[PDB]
Design a protein around this ligand. Sequence first.
Ligand code: NI
Length: 136
Amino acid sequence: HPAYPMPFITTILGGLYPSKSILLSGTVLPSAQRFHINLCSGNHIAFHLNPRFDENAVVRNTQIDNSWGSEERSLPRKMPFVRGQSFSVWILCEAHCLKVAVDGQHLFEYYHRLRNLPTINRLEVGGDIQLTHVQT
Ligand code: NI
């Protein structure tokens, strides 16, 4: 299985709605600094999932009208992404929030800030990973 182009951008036809899942698989590069997965709506970023290896954290935020909101960095356990290690990310959309699992285990919830779910119709992936699969 070859790698996807990076950055990878694709339309999510129909946008989001409760029960909608977005799955991503790949491998963190050996000396990765950071990578991100964005769910976009027009010129806004409804959800920015940003693992940072330099900061050893998983940052989540929203960018509306070019302004970043308040970051969410809370984690119930140790940073699950590891340099040079393969991973899977499952983003499940619900009515009130996005539920995110990593390597098959629930990690955190992100309450919707951009609530018109059907308008969140673009996926963008970038950064220090080798993207091996996307299920939209
Ligand atoms: Ni496929």
